[PDB]
Amino acid sequence: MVLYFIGLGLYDERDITVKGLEIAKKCDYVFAEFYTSLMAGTTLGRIQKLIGKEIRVLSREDVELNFENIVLPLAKENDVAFLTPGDPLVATTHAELRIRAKRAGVESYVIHAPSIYSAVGITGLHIYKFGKSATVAYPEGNWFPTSYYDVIKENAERGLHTLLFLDIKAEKNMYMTANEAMELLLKVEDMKKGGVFTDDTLVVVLARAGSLNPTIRAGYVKDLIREDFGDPPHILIVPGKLHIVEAEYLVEIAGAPREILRVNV
Amino acid sequence: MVLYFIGLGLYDERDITVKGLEIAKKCDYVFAEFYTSLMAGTTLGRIQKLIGKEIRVLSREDVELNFENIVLPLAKENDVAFLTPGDPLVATTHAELRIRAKRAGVESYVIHAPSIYSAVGITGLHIYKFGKSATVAYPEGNWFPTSYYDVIKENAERGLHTLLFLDIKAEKNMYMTANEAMELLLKVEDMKKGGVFTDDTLVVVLARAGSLNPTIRAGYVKDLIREDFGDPPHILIVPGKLHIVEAEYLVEIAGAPREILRVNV
Ligand SMILES: Nc1ncnc2c1ncn2[C@@H]1O[C@H](CSCC[C@H](N)C(=O)O)[C@@H](O)[C@H]1O
C-alpha cells in the first residue's frame, strides 16, 4: 500500500517523467486534479491512454475537504497515485496532503515533473536572480488583491526578477492572460503610485511553456499590453536590472527592443 | 536542421520526461554535458541503454569554446539532441547556446525536465517564499568568497527562504556535503558577525531529490552539522520566518524539532 504524488508536467501528457509513468502504470487506483494549472496540449483521454488506467478527477473541494475520505482509504490497501499538472508541490497546497497521509498511516512518495517555476529559464533570465514570487488574482466583489505589486517593488529594489503566476478558475474555464495581469497591475500603480509598473516597464511573457513552440516575448508594457500571446496558460515576469547576456537573449530570442542591450550599469 | 535541448532531470535515468526520451530516440546524434551538474543516481551507460543511442559527452571547453564546431554543424543537416542534467537553461550559461544556434541557422527547441530549483517544494517550504538563490563555493588558497552569506542575509531579513546550491567538481565526481556547507557558513559568520548563520539557525537539507528515497531533514545547525544525510547530491536551505503550515510539514515529514513551531513561526 502506498500513495504517490506524481506531476504530469507543463503542457501535454508526455511531460510526465519516465519514472512517473512507469509507476502510475502499475498503480491500482489513479486520481488527479486539474484545477491548480492548465495543461493546454492534452486531454484527460490522452493521459488515460498513456497510463493505461481510468483516472478519477477530483475537484478543489474533493481534495481540500475530503482527500482523506476519497483517496487515503484506498491507499491503505492498494497502490494509489494522485496526479497533478506541473510539479505536484509547486505553487499548490498539496504538500499538506502528505501530513494527512501520515496521520492515516499511509506512506507517500513524490515524483517530480517539469514546473513553470524553473521553465522560466527559457526566457533567458538567470534563474538565481528570481526573487520572491507572487500570484496576480482576479478581483472579486469589492475585494481587489494588490499584494503582488509589493512583491515586484521589493524584488526590483534588489535588482531581482519577479515571477508572477496568473490566476485560474478551472471550474469557470477562466485562465488569466498576461494582458489582463498587466491591466490589473497598471490599476494598482495608479493607486499606490510607486513607479513600480508603468507603460515604460519592461516585462516578459511566457505562454504555453512545455510546448515545442511556446510564445516568448519581451518588451514595454505599452507595446505588449494588447498583443496576442496565444492560448493560455500564461505567466508574466517583471525583470530587475538585466545582465548583458540576459538582454542579448531577450533581444535575439524574445524579440525585445534592441535598446535594452544598452544596460545602465 | 533541428537542435533539441533536453533535460535529464534530477537523479537517475528515468528522470527524463517521456517527451525527452522519445525525441532523443529519434535524433540522429546525441550529445550530453555533465559539467554543470551530475546525475548521481545513474551512469552514462544506463542513460545510453535507455535512449538506445550512442552518447557523446562534451566537456565545458567543448561547449563554451566549440559548441558551434562540434554540435551545430551536425544539427544543420540532422536532428540533434543535447542532454543536460536537470532542466535546460537553468544553468546560466545554457541560454546563450540558443543564440549560437540561431546565428548558425539552426532551429532549437527546449524539452524541460525537473530541476532542483522546483524540486525543493518537497521540503514543504512554499515556493513563492524563496528569494535569490546562491552557490556555496569551496574556499581555496587566499580566496575566500562569501557572497552566498550576504544572499541569505538579504532574503532572511525579508522573510524569504534561501536555496543554496552546493559546490561540485563534476569532472572529479566530488560533491560538497551539507555538513561542509554548514561548517563554511559558521566560519563566514565568525568573520562577518552579522548574526546570519549560527548554531541556532534552522536549516533544511534535501539530499538526492528525484529519488524515491530522498533525505529531507530540518533542524538547528548545532544538531545537524555532524549528521549523516546519505549520499550526494546535497542541497542546503536556510528558511526565513515560517508559515505554520510550512513548520508543521517540517516537523511531520522532515523530523524537525517541535521547537521550530514556537521559535521559527
Ligand atoms: N505551461 C505553462 N506555461 C505558462 N504558464 C504556466 C504553465 N503551467 C503553469 N503556468 C502558470 O502557473 C499557474 C499555475 S500555478 C501551479 C503550477 C504547477 N504546480 C507547476 O509546477 O507548474 C498558471 O495559472 C500559469 O500562470
Coordinates of C-alpha atoms and ligand atoms in Angstrom, one line a residue:
Chain A
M1 CA 0.0 0.0 0.0
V2 CA 1.3 3.5 -0.8
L3 CA 0.3 6.9 -2.1
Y4 CA 2.3 8.6 -5.0
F5 CA 2.0 12.3 -5.8
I6 CA 3.0 12.4 -9.5
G7 CA 3.5 15.5 -11.6
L8 CA 2.3 15.5 -15.2
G9 CA 4.4 18.4 -16.4
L10 CA 3.9 21.6 -18.3
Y11 CA 1.9 21.1 -21.4
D12 CA 0.9 17.6 -22.6
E13 CA 0.8 14.0 -21.4
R14 CA 4.4 13.4 -22.4
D15 CA 5.7 15.9 -19.9
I16 CA 5.4 13.2 -17.2
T17 CA 8.8 11.7 -16.3
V18 CA 9.5 8.1 -17.3
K19 CA 9.7 7.3 -13.6
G20 CA 6.2 8.8 -13.1
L21 CA 4.8 6.9 -16.0
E22 CA 6.2 3.5 -15.1
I23 CA 4.9 3.9 -11.5
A24 CA 1.5 5.2 -12.5
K25 CA 1.0 2.3 -14.9
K26 CA 1.4 -0.2 -12.0
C27 CA -0.9 1.6 -9.5
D28 CA -4.3 0.1 -8.6
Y29 CA -6.1 3.4 -8.5
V30 CA -5.3 6.7 -10.1
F31 CA -6.8 10.1 -9.1
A32 CA -6.0 13.5 -10.4
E33 CA -6.8 17.2 -10.1
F34 CA -6.7 19.8 -12.9
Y35 CA -7.6 23.0 -11.1
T36 CA -4.2 24.1 -10.0
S37 CA -2.9 24.6 -13.5
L38 CA -3.7 24.2 -17.2
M39 CA -2.2 21.6 -19.5
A40 CA -3.1 23.1 -22.8
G41 CA -1.7 20.4 -25.0
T42 CA -3.5 17.3 -23.9
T43 CA -6.9 15.9 -22.7
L44 CA -8.0 13.6 -19.9
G45 CA -8.4 10.9 -22.6
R46 CA -4.9 11.1 -23.8
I47 CA -3.5 10.9 -20.3
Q48 CA -5.7 7.9 -19.5
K49 CA -4.5 6.2 -22.7
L50 CA -0.8 6.8 -21.9
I51 CA -1.1 5.5 -18.3
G52 CA -3.5 2.7 -19.2
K53 CA -5.7 3.4 -16.2
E54 CA -9.0 5.0 -15.5
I55 CA -8.5 8.4 -13.9
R56 CA -10.9 9.8 -11.3
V57 CA -10.7 13.6 -11.4
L58 CA -11.2 15.4 -8.1
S59 CA -12.4 19.0 -7.6
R60 CA -10.8 21.5 -5.3
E61 CA -13.4 20.7 -2.6
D62 CA -12.9 16.9 -3.0
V63 CA -9.2 17.4 -2.4
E64 CA -9.1 20.2 0.2
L65 CA -12.1 18.9 2.2
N66 CA -12.2 15.2 1.5
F67 CA -8.7 13.9 0.4
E68 CA -8.7 11.7 3.5
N69 CA -12.1 10.3 2.6
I70 CA -11.7 9.8 -1.1
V71 CA -8.1 8.9 -1.7
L72 CA -6.4 7.8 1.5
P73 CA -8.8 5.0 2.4
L74 CA -7.8 3.1 -0.8
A75 CA -4.1 3.8 -0.2
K76 CA -4.2 1.8 2.9
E77 CA -4.7 -1.5 0.9
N78 CA -3.6 -0.6 -2.6
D79 CA -1.0 1.4 -4.6
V80 CA -2.6 4.7 -5.4
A81 CA -1.4 7.7 -7.4
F82 CA -2.6 11.3 -7.3
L83 CA -1.7 13.2 -10.5
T84 CA -1.4 17.0 -10.9
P85 CA -0.3 19.4 -13.6
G86 CA 3.3 20.6 -13.4
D87 CA 5.1 19.6 -10.2
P88 CA 2.7 18.4 -7.5
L89 CA 4.2 20.6 -4.8
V90 CA 4.9 23.8 -6.6
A91 CA 2.5 26.7 -6.1
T92 CA -0.1 24.4 -4.7
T93 CA -1.1 23.5 -1.1
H94 CA -0.7 19.8 -1.8
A95 CA 2.4 19.5 0.5
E96 CA -0.1 19.5 3.4
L97 CA -1.7 16.4 1.9
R98 CA 1.4 14.4 2.9
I99 CA 0.7 15.2 6.5
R100 CA -2.9 13.8 6.1
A101 CA -1.4 10.7 4.5
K102 CA 1.0 10.2 7.5
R103 CA -1.8 10.6 10.1
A104 CA -3.8 8.0 8.1
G105 CA -0.8 5.6 8.3
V106 CA -0.2 5.8 4.6
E107 CA 3.4 6.2 3.3
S108 CA 3.7 8.7 0.5
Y109 CA 6.2 9.3 -2.3
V110 CA 6.7 12.3 -4.6
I111 CA 7.6 12.1 -8.3
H112 CA 8.6 15.5 -9.7
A113 CA 7.8 16.8 -13.2
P114 CA 8.8 20.0 -15.1
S115 CA 7.4 23.1 -13.4
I116 CA 6.8 26.6 -14.7
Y117 CA 8.9 27.8 -11.7
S118 CA 12.0 26.5 -13.4
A119 CA 10.8 26.5 -17.0
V120 CA 11.1 30.3 -17.0
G121 CA 14.8 29.7 -17.6
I122 CA 13.8 29.6 -21.3
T123 CA 13.2 33.3 -21.1
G124 CA 17.0 33.7 -20.8
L125 CA 16.7 35.4 -17.4
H126 CA 19.2 33.9 -14.9
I127 CA 17.2 31.6 -12.6
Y128 CA 19.2 32.6 -9.5
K129 CA 18.2 36.2 -10.0
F130 CA 14.5 35.5 -9.4
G131 CA 13.3 36.8 -6.0
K132 CA 10.0 36.2 -4.2
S133 CA 7.2 35.1 -6.4
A134 CA 3.6 36.2 -6.4
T135 CA 0.2 35.5 -7.9
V136 CA -2.0 38.0 -9.7
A137 CA -5.5 37.1 -8.6
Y138 CA -8.8 38.2 -10.2
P139 CA -10.6 40.9 -8.2
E140 CA -13.9 39.7 -6.8
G141 CA -16.7 41.8 -5.5
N142 CA -15.3 44.7 -3.5
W143 CA -12.0 42.8 -3.0
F144 CA -9.1 43.8 -5.3
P145 CA -5.9 41.9 -4.4
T146 CA -2.7 44.0 -4.6
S147 CA 0.0 42.2 -2.7
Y148 CA 1.7 41.1 -5.9
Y149 CA 2.6 44.8 -6.6
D150 CA 4.6 45.0 -3.4
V151 CA 6.5 41.8 -4.3
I152 CA 7.6 43.4 -7.6
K153 CA 8.6 46.5 -5.8
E154 CA 10.6 44.6 -3.2
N155 CA 12.4 42.4 -5.7
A156 CA 13.1 45.3 -8.2
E157 CA 14.7 47.4 -5.4
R158 CA 17.1 44.5 -5.0
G159 CA 17.7 44.0 -8.7
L160 CA 15.8 40.7 -8.7
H161 CA 13.3 39.4 -11.3
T162 CA 9.7 38.7 -10.3
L163 CA 7.8 35.7 -11.4
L164 CA 4.0 36.2 -11.5
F165 CA 1.8 33.2 -11.5
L166 CA -1.6 34.2 -13.1
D167 CA -5.0 33.3 -11.7
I168 CA -7.0 30.3 -12.8
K169 CA -10.7 29.4 -12.3
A170 CA -10.8 25.9 -13.8
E171 CA -14.4 25.3 -13.0
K172 CA -15.3 28.5 -14.8
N173 CA -12.9 27.7 -17.6
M174 CA -11.2 31.0 -16.9
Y175 CA -7.4 31.5 -17.4
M176 CA -5.9 34.9 -16.7
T177 CA -3.9 36.2 -19.7
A178 CA -0.7 38.2 -19.4
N179 CA -2.8 41.1 -20.9
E180 CA -5.3 41.0 -18.1
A181 CA -2.5 40.9 -15.5
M182 CA -0.8 43.9 -17.0
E183 CA -4.1 45.8 -16.9
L184 CA -4.6 45.0 -13.2
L185 CA -1.0 46.0 -12.4
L186 CA -1.5 49.4 -14.1
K187 CA -4.6 50.0 -12.0
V188 CA -2.7 49.1 -8.8
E189 CA 0.1 51.5 -9.9
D190 CA -2.4 54.4 -10.2
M191 CA -3.4 53.7 -6.6
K192 CA 0.0 53.2 -4.9
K193 CA 1.9 55.4 -7.4
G194 CA 5.2 53.7 -6.5
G195 CA 6.5 53.8 -10.1
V196 CA 6.8 50.0 -10.0
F197 CA 4.7 49.2 -13.0
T198 CA 4.0 51.7 -15.8
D199 CA 3.7 51.8 -19.6
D200 CA 7.5 52.0 -19.8
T201 CA 8.2 48.9 -17.7
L202 CA 10.0 46.1 -19.4
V203 CA 8.1 42.8 -19.0
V204 CA 8.5 39.2 -20.3
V205 CA 5.6 36.9 -21.2
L206 CA 5.9 33.1 -21.4
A207 CA 2.9 31.3 -22.8
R208 CA 2.4 27.5 -23.0
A209 CA 5.8 26.6 -21.7
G210 CA 6.4 22.9 -22.4
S211 CA 5.1 23.0 -25.9
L212 CA 7.7 22.9 -28.7
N213 CA 6.8 26.4 -29.8
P214 CA 5.9 28.4 -26.6
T215 CA 5.4 32.2 -27.0
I216 CA 8.3 34.1 -25.5
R217 CA 8.0 37.9 -25.7
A218 CA 9.8 40.8 -24.1
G219 CA 9.0 44.5 -24.4
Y220 CA 7.5 47.5 -22.8
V221 CA 4.0 47.3 -21.2
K222 CA 2.7 50.0 -23.6
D223 CA 3.6 47.8 -26.6
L224 CA 2.7 44.3 -25.2
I225 CA -0.5 45.0 -23.2
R226 CA -2.7 44.4 -26.2
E227 CA -0.5 41.9 -28.0
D228 CA -1.9 38.4 -28.7
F229 CA 0.3 35.8 -26.9
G230 CA -1.9 32.9 -27.9
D231 CA -3.9 30.4 -25.8
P232 CA -3.3 30.1 -22.1
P233 CA -1.7 29.4 -19.7
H234 CA 0.4 32.5 -19.5
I235 CA 2.9 33.7 -16.9
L236 CA 4.2 37.3 -16.5
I237 CA 7.7 38.3 -15.4
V238 CA 8.9 41.7 -14.4
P239 CA 12.7 41.6 -14.7
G240 CA 15.0 43.5 -12.3
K241 CA 18.3 45.1 -13.6
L242 CA 19.5 42.9 -16.5
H243 CA 22.9 41.3 -17.1
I244 CA 24.1 42.0 -20.6
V245 CA 23.7 38.3 -21.7
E246 CA 20.1 38.3 -20.4
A247 CA 19.3 41.4 -22.5
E248 CA 21.0 39.8 -25.5
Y249 CA 18.8 36.7 -25.2
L250 CA 15.7 38.7 -24.8
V251 CA 16.5 40.7 -28.0
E252 CA 17.6 37.7 -30.1
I253 CA 15.0 35.1 -28.9
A254 CA 12.1 37.0 -27.4
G255 CA 12.0 39.9 -29.9
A256 CA 12.8 42.6 -27.3
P257 CA 13.6 46.2 -28.4
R258 CA 17.3 46.4 -29.2
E259 CA 17.6 49.4 -27.0
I260 CA 17.6 47.2 -23.9
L261 CA 21.0 45.9 -25.0
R262 CA 22.3 49.2 -23.6
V263 CA 22.2 48.4 -19.9
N264 CA 22.6 51.2 -17.4
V265 CA 25.3 49.8 -15.1
Chain B
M1 CA 18.2 21.4 -39.2
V2 CA 17.0 21.0 -35.6
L3 CA 18.7 21.0 -32.2
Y4 CA 16.9 19.8 -29.1
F5 CA 17.9 20.9 -25.6
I6 CA 16.7 18.0 -23.4
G7 CA 16.7 17.9 -19.7
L8 CA 17.6 14.7 -17.9
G9 CA 16.0 15.6 -14.6
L10 CA 17.1 15.2 -11.0
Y11 CA 18.7 11.9 -10.2
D12 CA 18.6 8.8 -12.4
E13 CA 17.9 7.8 -16.0
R14 CA 14.1 7.7 -15.5
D15 CA 14.0 11.4 -14.6
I16 CA 14.0 12.4 -18.2
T17 CA 10.4 13.1 -19.5
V18 CA 8.6 10.8 -21.9
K19 CA 8.8 13.6 -24.4
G20 CA 12.5 14.0 -24.0
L21 CA 13.1 10.3 -24.3
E22 CA 11.0 9.8 -27.4
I23 CA 12.6 12.8 -29.1
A24 CA 16.1 11.7 -28.1
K25 CA 15.5 8.2 -29.6
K26 CA 14.5 9.9 -32.8
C27 CA 17.6 12.0 -33.1
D28 CA 20.5 11.2 -35.4
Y29 CA 23.1 12.4 -33.0
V30 CA 23.0 12.7 -29.2
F31 CA 25.4 14.8 -27.2
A32 CA 25.5 15.5 -23.4
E33 CA 27.2 17.6 -20.8
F34 CA 27.9 16.7 -17.2
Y35 CA 29.9 19.7 -16.0
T36 CA 27.0 22.0 -14.9
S37 CA 26.0 19.1 -12.7
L38 CA 26.0 15.3 -12.4
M39 CA 23.3 12.5 -12.4
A40 CA 24.3 10.8 -9.2
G41 CA 21.7 8.0 -9.3
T42 CA 22.7 6.6 -12.7
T43 CA 25.6 6.1 -15.1
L44 CA 26.3 7.2 -18.7
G45 CA 25.9 3.6 -19.6
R46 CA 22.4 3.3 -18.2
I47 CA 21.4 6.6 -19.8
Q48 CA 22.7 5.3 -23.2
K49 CA 20.9 2.0 -22.8
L50 CA 17.6 3.8 -22.1
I51 CA 17.9 6.1 -25.1
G52 CA 19.3 3.3 -27.3
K53 CA 21.8 5.8 -28.8
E54 CA 25.5 6.4 -28.5
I55 CA 26.0 9.5 -26.4
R56 CA 29.0 11.8 -27.0
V57 CA 29.9 13.6 -23.8
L58 CA 31.2 17.2 -24.1
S59 CA 33.4 19.0 -21.6
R60 CA 33.0 22.6 -20.5
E61 CA 35.5 23.7 -23.1
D62 CA 33.8 21.7 -25.8
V63 CA 30.7 23.6 -25.2
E64 CA 31.8 27.1 -24.1
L65 CA 34.5 27.3 -26.7
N66 CA 33.4 25.0 -29.5
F67 CA 29.7 24.3 -29.4
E68 CA 29.3 25.8 -32.9
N69 CA 32.0 23.4 -34.3
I70 CA 31.1 20.2 -32.5
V71 CA 27.3 20.3 -32.2
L72 CA 25.8 22.8 -34.7
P73 CA 27.4 21.5 -37.9
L74 CA 25.6 18.2 -37.4
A75 CA 22.4 19.9 -36.3
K76 CA 22.4 21.8 -39.6
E77 CA 21.5 18.6 -41.6
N78 CA 20.3 16.2 -38.9
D79 CA 18.1 16.1 -35.8
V80 CA 20.5 16.5 -32.8
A81 CA 19.9 16.3 -29.1
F82 CA 21.9 18.0 -26.4
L83 CA 21.3 16.4 -23.0
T84 CA 21.8 18.3 -19.7
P85 CA 21.2 17.3 -16.1
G86 CA 18.1 19.0 -14.6
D87 CA 16.0 21.4 -16.6
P88 CA 17.7 23.0 -19.7
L89 CA 18.7 26.7 -19.3
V90 CA 18.5 26.7 -15.5
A91 CA 22.3 26.7 -15.7
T92 CA 23.1 30.3 -16.5
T93 CA 25.4 29.6 -19.5
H94 CA 23.0 27.4 -21.4
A95 CA 20.7 30.2 -22.7
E96 CA 23.4 31.7 -24.9
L97 CA 23.8 28.4 -26.8
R98 CA 20.3 29.1 -28.4
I99 CA 21.7 32.3 -29.8
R100 CA 24.6 30.4 -31.3
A101 CA 22.1 28.0 -32.8
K102 CA 20.2 31.0 -34.3
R103 CA 23.4 32.5 -35.7
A104 CA 24.2 29.2 -37.4
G105 CA 20.8 29.0 -39.0
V106 CA 19.8 26.0 -36.7
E107 CA 16.3 25.8 -35.1
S108 CA 16.3 24.9 -31.4
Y109 CA 13.6 23.7 -29.1
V110 CA 13.7 23.1 -25.3
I111 CA 12.3 19.9 -23.7
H112 CA 12.0 20.6 -20.0
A113 CA 12.6 18.2 -17.0
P114 CA 12.5 18.6 -13.2
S115 CA 15.1 20.9 -11.7
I116 CA 16.2 21.1 -8.1
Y117 CA 15.1 24.7 -8.2
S118 CA 11.5 23.5 -8.3
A119 CA 12.0 20.1 -6.6
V120 CA 12.7 21.9 -3.3
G121 CA 8.9 22.1 -3.0
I122 CA 9.2 18.6 -1.4
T123 CA 10.7 20.4 1.7
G124 CA 7.2 21.7 2.4
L125 CA 8.5 25.3 2.1
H126 CA 6.3 27.5 -0.1
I127 CA 7.9 28.0 -3.5
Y128 CA 6.9 31.7 -3.6
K129 CA 8.8 32.4 -0.4
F130 CA 12.2 31.5 -2.0
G131 CA 14.2 34.6 -2.7
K132 CA 17.5 35.0 -4.6
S133 CA 19.5 31.8 -4.9
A134 CA 23.2 31.3 -4.3
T135 CA 26.0 28.8 -4.6
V136 CA 28.4 27.9 -1.8
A137 CA 31.9 27.7 -3.2
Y138 CA 34.8 26.0 -1.5
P139 CA 37.4 28.5 -0.4
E140 CA 40.9 27.9 -1.8
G141 CA 44.3 29.5 -1.4
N142 CA 44.0 33.1 -0.4
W143 CA 40.5 33.3 -1.9
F144 CA 37.5 33.2 0.5
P145 CA 34.3 34.1 -1.4
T146 CA 31.3 34.9 0.9
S147 CA 28.6 36.3 -1.4
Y148 CA 26.3 33.5 -0.5
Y149 CA 26.2 34.6 3.1
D150 CA 25.0 38.0 2.0
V151 CA 22.3 36.4 -0.1
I152 CA 21.0 34.6 3.0
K153 CA 21.1 37.8 5.0
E154 CA 19.1 39.8 2.4
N155 CA 16.5 37.0 1.9
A156 CA 16.0 36.3 5.6
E157 CA 15.6 39.9 6.6
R158 CA 12.7 40.0 4.1
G159 CA 11.2 36.8 5.5
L160 CA 12.3 34.7 2.4
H161 CA 14.0 31.3 2.1
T162 CA 17.4 30.8 0.6
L163 CA 18.2 27.9 -1.7
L164 CA 21.9 27.1 -1.6
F165 CA 23.4 25.0 -4.4
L166 CA 26.5 23.3 -3.0
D167 CA 29.9 23.2 -4.8
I168 CA 30.5 20.3 -7.2
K169 CA 33.7 19.3 -9.1
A170 CA 31.8 17.5 -11.8
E171 CA 35.0 16.4 -13.6
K172 CA 36.2 14.8 -10.3
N173 CA 32.8 13.5 -9.2
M174 CA 33.3 15.3 -5.9
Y175 CA 30.4 16.9 -4.0
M176 CA 30.4 19.4 -1.1
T177 CA 28.2 18.0 1.6
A178 CA 25.6 19.9 3.6
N179 CA 27.8 19.4 6.6
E180 CA 30.8 21.1 4.9
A181 CA 28.5 23.9 3.8
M182 CA 27.3 24.5 7.4
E183 CA 30.9 24.5 8.7
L184 CA 31.8 27.0 6.0
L185 CA 28.8 29.2 6.9
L186 CA 29.7 29.2 10.6
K187 CA 33.2 30.3 9.6
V188 CA 31.9 33.1 7.5
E189 CA 29.6 34.1 10.4
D190 CA 32.6 34.2 12.7
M191 CA 34.3 36.6 10.2
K192 CA 31.3 38.9 9.4
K193 CA 29.4 38.5 12.7
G194 CA 26.2 39.6 11.0
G195 CA 24.1 37.1 13.1
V196 CA 23.0 35.4 9.9
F197 CA 24.1 31.8 10.4
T198 CA 24.8 30.4 13.9
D199 CA 24.3 27.2 15.9
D200 CA 20.7 28.3 16.5
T201 CA 19.9 28.8 12.8
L202 CA 17.2 26.5 11.4
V203 CA 18.2 24.8 8.2
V204 CA 16.8 22.2 5.8
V205 CA 18.8 19.6 4.0
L206 CA 17.5 17.9 0.9
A207 CA 19.6 15.0 -0.4
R208 CA 19.0 13.0 -3.6
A209 CA 15.9 14.8 -4.7
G210 CA 14.3 12.8 -7.5
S211 CA 15.0 9.6 -5.8
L212 CA 12.1 7.6 -4.3
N213 CA 14.0 7.9 -1.0
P214 CA 15.4 11.4 -0.7
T215 CA 16.7 12.5 2.7
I216 CA 14.7 15.5 4.0
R217 CA 15.8 16.8 7.3
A218 CA 15.2 20.1 9.2
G219 CA 16.7 21.2 12.5
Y220 CA 19.2 23.5 14.1
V221 CA 22.7 23.8 12.9
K222 CA 24.1 22.7 16.3
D223 CA 22.2 19.4 15.8
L224 CA 22.6 18.7 12.1
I225 CA 26.2 19.8 11.4
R226 CA 27.5 16.3 12.0
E227 CA 24.5 14.3 10.9
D228 CA 24.8 11.8 8.1
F229 CA 22.4 12.8 5.3
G230 CA 23.4 10.0 3.0
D231 CA 25.0 10.1 -0.5
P232 CA 25.1 13.2 -2.7
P233 CA 23.9 15.4 -4.0
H234 CA 23.0 17.6 -1.0
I235 CA 21.2 20.9 -1.1
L236 CA 21.1 23.3 1.8
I237 CA 18.2 25.7 2.5
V238 CA 18.1 28.4 5.2
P239 CA 14.4 29.2 5.6
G240 CA 13.1 32.6 6.5
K241 CA 10.3 33.0 9.0
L242 CA 7.9 30.1 8.6
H243 CA 4.1 29.9 7.9
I244 CA 2.7 27.5 10.4
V245 CA 1.8 25.1 7.6
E246 CA 5.5 25.0 6.5
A247 CA 6.6 24.4 10.0
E248 CA 4.2 21.5 10.6
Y249 CA 5.4 19.8 7.4
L250 CA 9.0 20.2 8.5
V251 CA 8.1 18.6 11.9
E252 CA 5.9 15.8 10.5
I253 CA 7.8 14.9 7.3
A254 CA 11.4 16.2 7.9
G255 CA 11.8 15.3 11.5
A256 CA 12.2 18.9 12.7
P257 CA 12.1 19.6 16.4
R258 CA 8.8 20.7 17.9
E259 CA 10.7 23.8 19.0
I260 CA 10.5 25.3 15.5
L261 CA 6.8 25.7 15.8
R262 CA 7.3 28.3 18.5
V263 CA 10.8 29.7 17.6
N264 CA 10.6 29.9 13.8
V265 CA 7.0 30.8 13.1
Ligands
LIG1 N1 3.0 25.6 -19.3 C1 2.8 26.8 -18.7 N2 3.1 27.9 -19.4 C2 2.9 29.2 -18.9 N3 2.5 29.4 -17.6 C3 2.2 28.2 -16.9 C4 2.3 26.9 -17.4 N4 2.0 26.0 -16.4 C5 1.6 26.7 -15.4 N5 1.7 28.1 -15.6 C6 1.5 29.2 -14.8 O1 1.3 28.8 -13.4 C7 -0.1 28.9 -12.9 C8 -0.4 27.6 -12.1 S1 0.4 27.6 -10.6 C9 0.6 25.8 -10.4 C10 2.0 25.4 -11.0 C11 2.4 24.0 -11.1 N6 2.4 23.2 -9.8 C12 3.8 23.9 -11.8 O2 4.7 23.2 -11.2 O3 3.9 24.5 -12.9 C13 -0.9 29.1 -14.2 O4 -2.1 29.8 -13.9 C14 0.1 29.9 -15.1 O5 0.2 31.3 -14.8

